[PDB]
Design a protein around this ligand. Structure first.
Ligand SMILES: CCCCCCCCCCCCCCCCCC(=O)OC[C@H](COP(=O)([O-])OCC(O)COP(=O)([O-])OC[C@@H](COC(=O)CCCCCCCCCCCCCCCCC)OC(=O)CCCCCCCCCCCCCCCCC)OC(=O)CCCCCCCCCCCCCCCCC
Ligand SMILES: CCCCCCCCCCCCCCCCCC(=O)OC[C@H](COP(=O)([O-])OCC(O)COP(=O)([O-])OC[C@@H](COC(=O)CCCCCCCCCCCCCCCCC)OC(=O)CCCCCCCCCCCCCCCCC)OC(=O)CCCCCCCCCCCCCCCCC
Ligand SMILES: CCCCCCCCCCCCCCCCCC(=O)OC[C@H](COP(=O)([O-])OCC(O)COP(=O)([O-])OC[C@@H](COC(=O)CCCCCCCCCCCCCCCCC)OC(=O)CCCCCCCCCCCCCCCCC)OC(=O)CCCCCCCCCCCCCCCCC
Ligand SMILES: CCCCCCCCCCCCCCCCCC(=O)OC[C@H](COP(=O)([O-])OCC(O)COP(=O)([O-])OC[C@@H](COC(=O)CCCCCCCCCCCCCCCCC)OC(=O)CCCCCCCCCCCCCCCCC)OC(=O)CCCCCCCCCCCCCCCCC
Ligand SMILES: CCCCCCCCCCCCCCCCCC(=O)OC[C@H](COP(=O)([O-])OCC[N+](C)(C)C)OC(=O)CCCCCCCCCCCCCCCCC
Ligand SMILES: CCCCCCCC/C=C\CCCCCCCC(=O)O[C@H](COC(=O)CCCCCCC/C=C/CCCCCCCC)COP(=O)(O)OCCN
Ligand SMILES: CCCCCCCC/C=C\CCCCCCCC(=O)O[C@H](COC(=O)CCCCCCC/C=C/CCCCCCCC)COP(=O)(O)OCCN
Lengths: 129, 80, 62, 65, 129, 65
């Protein structure tokens, strides 16, 4: 209960010391000196940057739309772009299926009252679920 | 500016243009709280009352209080 | 009379004054109690009282 | 300002649109099922009323006033 | 359909130019010159940093546990710490309630078979839901 | 290495633990309800069997062998 905690802390300390990233080590040392948390500071910095980059995202979206519509994207089409587009299509399909499932709030389609499967609904072991 | 019906008061100028033009601005003497002072955002550099307590955090605290108020009886119901 | 006082320029400044901190807490309560009611009162497992036709305020006040 | 080497933002927007369309499909299906069940329950109540009326009529004939 | 898109793009461009952050502007200029996306790069940097800071989080957790257990935290207790602890307690309570709701997969407690409310379950308009 | 000015990690761990405990409470409640309903269904089936046996016995007496 205490030996295990000490062992875990020692392992994490060894791994933290092992990494040879100058920036990470510098930030860790600075936060340890100041007594602050590096991970939380990184999270806040990332959120601030994303907040300040929203309109950059919008501008990039419009620029990409113009690039695609102009036909310049397909002029330099390559196999790598085909692979990326296949990945994109797969994600679209899976998202559509998930959206349908959430929209009907049920994995399976609901049973119509005129279907012969209504008996199954009547014979539920636990009507609450 | 305005926040709902609350409008930020604005100080009326007292100096004439001729006298105003002769004024030398030295922000080194200004407090750190008010540097690059902007009438449209005078409290941009103002310190937080509690370090690390954001406005969104308080908003979320209120939302959580409301959720508790509405859901506590669902988990710990009591008889009449 | 609405003459003056601290006025935050935007949401992020509400934390620069205790009074506005309490105000934003209250606003959060106000606006977040509505989603809670949506979730609670539109729940799948919510069931009308079987005896709802036994009595109602409409008969009583009539 | 060179041409964009990636289309991340457009892909994200398309992901959102696809999920939204799926949600609409599911909502439409659920709404149709709910309407069907409402009509079925109404028909059941009507049939029950007709059965009760028939029983009352038979009891009235037995009364023989 | 096109005028609205142009107006939105113009507004976002104006807002992007308005910000006076040297780092944000520098990154935007560099990515525009290279044709890459700044927001995605920021996301990847944040994820990499968090991946490299996991054991730092563990070490910080153990250090904080030692600090609290040693009683040094309560020695310098102030009103601000009380406010933070109240926030912490509120989050704990709300999380507990949400966890219970998810655990039983129902907003309301399930109805027992011997309860008189079972009729309500039988008289559901749509048994599928 | 100064003392920590914030306890974010401990608070996050406590958040996770609280959510987990709530999940356990809900799971226990649901499991108990499921067991109760299973027992109720078993009793219903037993009662149906007894009723069928009684009906068969009455029919046997009517047969009068
Ligand atoms: C049917 C519909 C019902 C609907 C109901 C209503 C729905 C909600 C409506 C809204 C309600 C009001 C709003 C409430 C919001 C509450 C949440 C919130 O605000 O969060 C922010 C809050 C942090 O806010 P903060 O303090 O201001 O942060 C300051 C900085 O920003 C900090 O910045 P940072 O840099 O730290 O950022 C990272 C930070 C922030 O990250 C986040 O924001 C996370 C996401 C936030 C939302 C979480 C919602 C949770 C709701 C319940 C679960 C739903 C699914 C969530 C999926 C999340 C996927 C990531 O990450 C965390 O918070 C980490 C949390 C996880 C810690 C993991 C440690 C595990 C250690 C285990 C050790 C065990 C050892 C045992 C040894 C025993 C030996 C004997 O984070 C949390 O509260 C995290 C909660 C996580 C709960 C997870 C529970 C999962 C289920 C149990 C586990 C089961 C599987 C595993 C079992 C293993 C066996 C034990
Ligand atoms: C100018 C006027 C202002 C209002 C004046 C009075 C009223 C006038 C009317 C308008 C009122 C609007 C409401 C107030 C504004 C709220 C948004 C805001 O300003 O945020 C500032 C804030 C940035 O400024 P900041 O104050 O410096 O905050 C710094 C950071 O937040 C960093 O904060 P931190 O350092 O304290 O960190 C706290 C901690 C805590 O952060 C979090 O935990 C993130 C939040 C997690 C969800 C908790 C519940 C949130 C509330 C949902 C329900 C809201 C209902 C009420 C909304 C009413 C809206 C009118 O952060 C984290 O740990 C990072 C979170 C990472 C995890 C992400 C994944 C979350 C998953 C959640 C799980 C649950 C999902 C549900 C299902 C679960 C099933 C199992 O933005 C945000 O970060 C919020 C982003 C989300 C925006 C939407 C929020 C809801 C809708 C707002 C509508 C706004 C309309 C405004 C009208 C203006 C017309 C032009
Ligand atoms: C009952 C149980 C059922 C269980 C079913 C199964 C459950 C799942 C099991 C697992 C299945 C396999 C795994 C599938 C994973 C799929 C997701 C995934 O991987 O995502 C990664 C993928 C990005 O991956 P990537 O391309 O590799 O990223 C590269 C870089 O990392 C990029 O880095 P970065 O820097 O870009 O990072 C940010 C990025 C990454 O952030 C994330 O990763 C986001 C979270 C990822 C998970 C999303 C899951 C979604 C699943 C369905 C929804 C569930 C709730 C999700 C809540 C999310 C809260 C944040 O953010 C986004 O992705 C942004 C997406 C949102 C865009 C919003 C733009 C809206 C514009 C609208 C304009 C309309 C104008 C109309 C004008 C009309 C004029 C006539 O992101 C998405 O696919 C995002 C999908 C978001 C869908 C949201 C749908 C919400 C519902 C509809 C909206 C309803 C309310 C609003 C209506 C308003 C009126 C229209
Ligand atoms: C060494 C052995 C190797 C294998 C040997 C051969 C095989 C042996 C058999 C066993 C193999 C085990 C599986 C392989 C390992 C997988 C884990 C791994 O290595 O990941 C590293 C990977 C980093 O690798 P990397 O290549 O440097 O990636 C760079 C970045 O990821 C950046 O990537 P990016 O640039 O591509 O970004 C893409 C994009 C796309 O990012 C995303 O979309 C993020 C993912 C979103 C969730 C999608 C589903 C994920 C999959 C779940 C189901 C998995 C089933 C299979 C698991 C089997 C495990 C045995 O990212 C984003 O935009 C950022 C995401 C921000 C959104 C965050 C919020 C997400 C909300 C999700 C909502 C849906 C929740 C469900 C409910 C919804 C209700 C409405 O770390 C992660 O990010 C892991 C995150 C997930 C952790 C849990 C995954 C499942 C459990 C795995 C257990 C593995 C145990 C291994 C034990 C080994 C002991 C020695
Ligand atoms: C040996 C020692 C052992 C010690 C063990 C200690 C164990 C402690 C366990 C946890 C205890 C938790 C107690 C608190 C939660 C109580 C929940 C409860 O009862 O709720 C029911 C009550 C409701 O009771 P109810 O159920 O009757 O109400 C329901 C009413 N209807 C039906 C109409 C919806 O919930 C509340 O009232 C919640 C109110 C909010 C609670 C949080 C307050 C936080 C502070 C906010 C104000 C300050 C903001 C300042 C901002 C500005 C700053 C400058
Ligand atoms: C575990 C939670 C997982 C969360 C995933 C959510 C995905 C949802 C995707 C689809 C949503 C739209 C569905 C449309 C149909 C809903 C119909 C409905 O009400 O069904 C309820 C589901 O409804 C709910 O419980 C949720 C209602 C809405 C919840 C709102 C969530 C929080 C919103 C915050 C708003 C704050 C302001 C934001 C402004 C942004 C936009 C301007 C279940 O009951 P039924 O079986 O249909 O019948 C009940 C009759 N006895
Ligand atoms: C919109 C979705 C929102 C998602 C929120 C999820 C929150 C859940 C929190 C609680 C989870 C534990 C609940 C315990 C009880 C579960 C019982 C169960 O399976 O219930 C099913 C629901 O279960 C499921 O469908 C889900 C089963 C498990 C899903 C797993 C998801 C993917 C996990 C990937 C793991 C990858 C490896 C990671 C390892 C981590 C751990 C080491 C429904 O039950 P009934 O309707 O009564 O019966 C149906 C038949 N008559």
């Amino acid at each position: 209960l205490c030996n295990a905690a000490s062992k875990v802390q020692a392992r994490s300390a060894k791994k933290l010391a092992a990494l040879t990233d100058a920036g990470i080590q510098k930030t860790i040392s600075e936060h340890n000196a100041n007594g602050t948390d590096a991970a939380v500071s990184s999270t806040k910095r990332y959120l601030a940057e994303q907040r300040q980059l929203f309109h950059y995202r919008v501008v990039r979206f419009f620029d990409e739309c113009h690039y695609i519509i102009s036909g310049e994207y397909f002029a330099q089409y390559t196999k790598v772009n085909l692979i990326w587009d296949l990945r994109f299509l797969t994600k679209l399909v899976v998202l559509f299926l998930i959206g349908t499932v959430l929209g009907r709030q049920s994995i399976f389609p609901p049973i119509d009252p005129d279907s012969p499967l209504v008996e199954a609904l009547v014979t539920k072991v636990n009507p609450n679920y | 500016y305005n926040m709902l019906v609350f409008r930020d008061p604005k100080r009326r100028p007292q100096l004439s243009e001729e006298e105003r033009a002769k004024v030398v601005v030295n922000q080194a003497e200004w407090p750190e709280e008010f540097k690059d002072f902007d009438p449209d955002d005078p409290y941009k550099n103002s310190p937080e009352i509690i370090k690390g307590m954001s406005s969104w955090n308080l908003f979320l605290w209120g939302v959580e209080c409301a959720f508790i108020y509405q859901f506590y009886e669902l988990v710990f119901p009591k008889s009449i | 009379m609405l003459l003056g006082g601290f006025v935050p320029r935007r949401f992020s400044q509400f934390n620069r004054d205790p009074c506005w901190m309490f105000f934003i807490f209250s606003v959060g309560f106000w606006l977040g109690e509505y989603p809670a009611m949506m979730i609670k009162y539109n729940a799948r497992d919510l069931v009308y009282d079987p005896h709802r036709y036994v009595w109602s305020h409409h008969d009583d006040h009539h | 300002k060179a041409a964009p080497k990636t289309l991340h933002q457009v892909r994200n927007v398309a992901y959102f649109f696809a999920a939204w369309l799926g949600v609409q499909k599911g909502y439409i299906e659920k709404s149709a099922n709910d309407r069907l069940w409402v009509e079925h329950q109404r028909k059941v109540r009507q049939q029950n009323v007709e059965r009760q009326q028939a029983l009352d009529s038979i009891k009235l004939m037995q009364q023989g006033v």
